[PDB]
C-alpha cells in the first residue's frame, strides 16, 4: 500500500459531512495563504509592469552598455565589432557619447550628445519627425535636439546653437579655452520621455573631432542587452584586454536602484500576510491535536513510529500549503493580464493609460516555494510535540 502516513493525512483534512462547517474551519489557513499569495503576485506584477515601462522609456533610448579603451579614444581597427562578442548582448554599434553645454540666444542648458553614423538606425529614429536619418552627414554639423530641450531653449529648425565642452579645455596664454562649435538644427526629436530632455544627436565624425580626438577615433562600442536588469552580472564577464566597461548605472542607476528597493520594501510589506497565515497553521494543528489526541494514541499502539506520526501531520500541513499556494498562484495569474478589463467598470484612480501589467513566472515560482517552506516550518513544531507525548499522559 502507499506509505501509511499519506492515507491518514489525506483522510483527516476531508470528511465530517454532518455539518459542512468543519471543512471551512480547517481550510481557513488555505484561504488566508491564498489571499496572501494573490496580493503578492498581483502587486509585484503591477510594479514589474511599471518598471518595464520605465526601462523602455529611460534605458530604452540611451546606451545600455559602453565599452571603451583604457587610455584615450577607441580605435575601430584594434577591436572590430565582429571580434567584440559577449554573452547576453544582442547588438553592437559604434558610438561616441559626451556631456556638453548648449547655448542658445535666450537661455542655456546642459545636454548629452550622441555621435553616431547616420546610416544606422537608433530606437529613437521612429520618433524622429521631419528629419531624414541619413541627412546627418559629416562636415555640415547637423544636430537633432529633443522636444523638451528645444522648447526650453525656444529654438527650432534653421537656428544655430553654440555647443561647448569644458572638460576638454586647452590651456593658452588667454586662459583655459573650452572647445566650442556652432551647430545647425535640422529637426526635432520627440520621444515623450525623460531622455527627450537631455539627449541630442550628431554625426559621429564631427562628434569625434569635437572632443579633440585624433581623426578616425571613436569613443567606444554601444552594446544592447536582452535583459539589462543583470548588468552587474555582465560586469563580471571577462573583457578583451585593454578595455574598460561602463554602463547606465553611472547616470540612472540610483533611481532604478531606488525602484528596486521600493519593490522589495513592498515585497516585505505584503509578505507579512503569509507570515501571519503561517501562525494560523500552528493554531489549526493546536486544534486538531487536542481534537485528535484521544485517537492518535491508538495509532501509537499500532506500529506507527513517532517518526511516522511526525510525517502524518507534517504532510497534512504541507498539503494545505501546496493547495493554497497553487490555487493562489492560479487566481493571481487570472487576475493579472486581465485587471485592465475589470478596472474601468469601477472607479479608476489613474488618468490616461489604465495600468501596465507584466508578469514574470520566476517571481511567481519563487514566492510559491517561499510559501511552501513557510508552511512546512509552521507545521513542524506541533507535529513534534504530538509525537514526543507518551501515550499514558495523553490517556491520563
Amino acid at each position: 500500500y502507499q506509505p501509511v502516513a499519506l492515507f491518514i493525512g489525506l483522510r483527516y483534512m476531508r470528511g465530517r459531512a454532518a455539518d459542512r462547517f468543519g471543512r471551512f474551519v480547517s481550510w481557513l489557513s488555505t484561504i488566508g495563504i491564498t489571499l496572501g499569495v494573490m496580493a503578492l503576485v498581483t502587486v509585484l506584477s503591477v510594479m514589474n509592469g511599471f518598471e518595464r515601462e520605465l526601462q523602455n522609456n529611460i534605458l530604452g533610448l540611451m546606451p545600455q552598455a559602453i565599452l571603451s579603451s583604457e587610455h584615450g579614444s577607441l580605435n575601430p581597427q584594434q577591436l572590430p565589432e565582429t571580434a567584440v562578442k559577449l554573452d547576453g548582448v544582442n547588438r553592437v554599434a559604434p558610438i561616441t557619447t559626451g556631456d556638453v553645454v548648449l547655448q542658445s540666444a535666450r537661455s542655456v542648458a546642459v545636454g548629452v550628445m550622441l555621435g553616431i553614423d547616420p546610416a544606422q538606425k537608433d530606437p529613437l529614429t521612429p520618433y524622429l519627425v521631419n528629419v531624414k536619418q541619413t541627412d546627418l552627414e559629416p562636415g555640415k554639423y547637423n544636430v537633432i535636439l529633443g522636444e523638451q530641450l528645444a522648447s526650453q531653449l525656444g529654438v527650432n529648425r534653421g537656428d544655430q546653437i553654440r555647443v561647448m565642452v569644458p572638460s576638454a579645455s586647452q590651456f593658452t596664454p588667454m586662459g583655459r579655452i573650452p572647445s566650442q562649435r556652432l551647430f545647425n538644427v535640422i529637426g526635432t526629436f520627440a520621444a515623450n520621455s525623460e531622455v527627450d530632455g537631455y539627449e541630442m544627436l550628431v554625426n559621429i565624425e564631427d562628434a569625434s573631432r569635437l572632443m579633440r580626438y585624433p581623426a578616425g577615433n571613436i569613443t567606444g562600442w554601444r552594446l544592447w542587452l536582452d535583459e539589462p536588469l543583470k548588468v552587474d552580472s555582465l560586469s563580471q564577464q571577462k573583457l578583451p584586454e585593454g578595455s574598460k566597461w561602463q554602463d547606465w548605472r553611472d547616470r540612472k542607476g540610483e533611481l532604478f536602484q531606488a525602484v528596486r528597493m521600493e519593490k522589495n520594501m513592498m515585497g516585505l510589506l505584503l509578505s507579512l500576510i503569509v507570515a501571519v497565515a503561517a501562525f494560523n497553521i500552528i493554531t489549526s494543528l493546536g486544534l486538531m491535536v487536542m481534537e485528535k489526541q484521544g485517537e492518535v494514541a491508538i495509532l501509537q499502539t499500532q506500529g506507527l513510529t513517532p517518526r511516522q506520526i511526525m510525517m502524518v501531520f507534517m504532510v497534512q500541513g504541507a498539503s494545505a500549503g501546496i493547495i493554497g499556494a497553487i490555487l493562489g498562484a492560479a487566481l493571481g495569474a487570472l487576475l493579472a493580464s486581465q485587471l485592465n478589463n475589470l478596472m474601468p467598470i469601477i472607479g479608476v484612480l489613474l488618468d490616461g493609460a489604465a495600468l501596465p501589467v507584466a508578469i514574470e513566472p520566476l517571481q511567481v515560482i519563487v514566492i510559491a516555494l517561499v510559501a511552501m517552506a513557510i508552511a512546512l516550518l509552521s507545521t513542524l513544531y506541533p507535529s513534534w510535540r504530538a509525537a514526543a507525548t507518551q501515550p499514558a499522559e495523553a490517556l491520563r
Binding site: F21, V25, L28, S29, I31, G32, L35, G36, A39, V101, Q103, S104, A105, R106, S107, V108, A109, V110, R162, P166, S169, R176, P178, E254, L255, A258, M261, M266, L269, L270, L272, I273, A275, V276, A277, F279, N280, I282, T283, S284, G286, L287, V289, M290, E291, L349, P382, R385
Partner: protein
C-alpha cells in the same frame, strides 16, 4: 456591573497549561505585528506629509504668472491689482535668468532667481532655511549671490569666494554672440531638500535688472495663497483680473503627484493590514471553536438555568472581543513606543546594515520622519475591534443553536 463577566471567567478559565497558551501568544503576536506595523506606516506617512508641508511648499512660489511677449511695462500695476484679490496671501515680482556659473575650472549651467528681499520675506520662508548668513543684509549693489549647498560642493566653492557668471544677454544687434561674463561673490549656502537645492541660485533684483541691461521690469510674478490645495482655480482667477497676456503656472501640476502618492501609500497599507487582521481573526475563530467544543458542558449548564438564546451568544462575542482586545492593546503599546523614537531606530538599522535608504537626491528628504496623530490610532483600534467582532460573530451563533439534550441523549 454587567452580567457578561462570566466570559472573563472563561477567559481566566485556562487549563492544561502548555501547548494551549502557545496558541494564545501566537494570536497575540499576529495581532500585535499587524497593528504595530500599520501604526508605523501611518505615522511615517504623516511625517512625510509634515515635511513636505514645511521643507518644500514653503520655499517654492505657490503661483506663477509670466508674460509671453515682453517683460511687463506695468508689472506694479498688475501686482497691486492682484494683491486685493480674495484668497491670496501675497504677491511679488521676480526675474528669471539662466547662466553659467564657473569656479575652480568647474562649470555648471543653472537657473537664477532675482527677487526683492523685503518682499520675498513675506512671500516665503526660504531665508529662514539658510544655515547661516546675512539672510536680511542681502541687498543690491554688492555683487553677491547665494548658492545651494549641492551646487557649492559640486563646484568646490565655499563661503566668501568669487565666481564668474556668464549670461547670453541676447540683443537684436550683433552683441548676442559671445555671452557676457560678469564676476560675483557668493555669500551663503542653502539646505532645502534632496532636489530643490541643486538648482536654486538667488541674486538681488536691482542688481538683476542692472546685470541684464534691461528696463525696470521683471520676467514674472510669484503668488502665495492662504490655501494651497485649490491653487489652480485661484491663480486662474488672479490672472483673469489682469491683462490676458499672462500665462499661469500652478505648483499643483508639478507636485500633486507627491500628495496623491502619499494617499495611495496610506490606502495600500490600510488594505494590506486589514487583510492581516482578517487572517488573525480567522485565528480567533479557530480559538473560539476550540473554546465552544471544550465548554459545551458549561454552556449546557448555563442553558438549563433558563438563559435566553442570545445570552450565550453575548457571552461568546464578549469572549472573542476580549481576546482581540488583549492583542490590540499589546500591539498599540509598541505602536506608540515607536513613531516617537523611530528616527534613531532607523538610523541604527542604517548603521548596522550598510545600505542607504532614501539619500542620493531621489526622495525629497534624506531621513525618515514621523508624526503621531491620535485620531488615526483610534480609527485603527476600532478597525481591529470590528474585525475581531465580525470574526467572533459566527461561532457564537453556532454555539447558540446546540441543544444539550440533542447530544446528551
Amino acid at each position: 456591573p454587567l452580567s457578561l463577566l462570566i466570559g472573563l471567567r472563561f477567559s481566566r478559565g485556562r487549563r492544561r497549561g502548555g501547548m494551549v497558551s502557545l496558541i494564545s501568544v501566537i494570536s497575540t503576536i499576529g495581532i500585535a505585528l499587524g497593528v504595530a506595523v500599520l501604526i508605523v506606516g501611518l505615522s511615517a506617512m504623516n511625517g512625510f506629509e509634515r515635511e513636505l508641508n514645511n521643507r518644500i511648499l514653503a520655499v517654492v512660489p505657490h503661483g506663477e504668472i509670466e508674460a509671453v511677449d515682453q517683460p511687463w511695462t506695468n508689472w506694479q500695476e498688475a501686482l497691486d491689482h492682484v494683491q486685493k484679490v480674495p484668497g491670496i496671501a501675497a504677491a511679488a515680482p521676480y526675474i528669471n535668468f539662466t547662466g553659467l556659473v564657473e569656479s575652480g575650472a568647474n562649470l555648471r549651467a543653472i537657473q537664477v532667481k532675482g527677487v526683492n528681499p523685503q518682499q520675498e520675506q513675506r512671500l516665503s520662508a526660504l531665508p529662514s532655511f539658510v544655515q547661516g548668513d546675512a539672510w536680511r543684509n542681502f541687498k543690491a549693489g554688492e555683487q553677491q549671490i547665494i548658492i545651494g549647498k549641492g551646487v557649492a560642493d559640486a563646484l568646490k566653492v565655499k563661503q566668501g569666494d568669487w565666481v564668474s557668471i556668464m549670461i547670453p544677454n541676447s540683443n537684436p544687434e550683433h552683441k548676442l554672440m559671445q555671452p557676457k561674463r560678469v564676476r560675483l561673490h557668493v555669500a551663503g549656502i542653502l539646505q532645502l531638500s534632496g532636489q530643490l537645492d541643486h538648482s536654486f541660485a538667488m541674486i538681488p533684483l536691482a542688481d538683476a535688472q542692472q546685470y541684464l541691461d534691461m528696463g525696470s521690469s521683471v520676467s514674472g510674478i510669484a503668488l502665495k495663497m492662504t490655501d494651497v490645495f485649490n491653487a489652480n482655480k485661484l491663480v486662474r482667477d488672479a490672472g483673469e483680473v489682469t491683462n490676458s497676456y499672462v500665462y499661469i503656472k500652478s505648483w499643483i501640476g508639478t507636485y500633486g503627484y507627491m500628495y496623491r502618492d502619499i494617499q495611495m501609500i496610506r490606502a495600500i497599507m490600510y488594505l494590506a493590514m486589514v487583510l492581516v487582521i482578517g487572517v488573525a481573526c480567522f485565528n480567533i475563530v479557530s480559538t473560539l471553536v476550540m473554546a465552544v467544543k471544550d465548554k459545551s458542558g458549561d454552556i449546557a449548564v448555563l442553558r438549563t438555568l433558563g438563559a435566553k438564546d442570545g445570552l450565550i451568544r453575548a457571552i461568546f462575542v464578549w469572549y472573542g472581543l476580549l481576546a482581540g482586545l488583549f492583542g490590540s492593546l499589546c500591539g498599540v503599546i509598541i505602536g506608540v513606543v515607536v513613531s516617537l523614537q523611530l528616527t534613531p531606530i532607523i538610523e541604527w538599522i542604517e548603521k548596522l546594515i550598510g545600505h542607504q535608504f532614501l539619500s542620493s537626491d531621489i526622495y525629497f528628504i534624506d531621513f525618515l520622519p514621523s508624526e503621531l496623530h491620535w485620531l488615526d490610532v483610534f480609527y485603527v483600534l476600532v478597525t481591529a475591534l470590528l474585525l475581531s467582532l465580525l470574526a467572533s460573530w459566527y461561532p457564537a451563533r453556532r454555539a447558540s443553536n446546540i441543544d444539550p439534550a440533542r447530544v446528551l441523549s
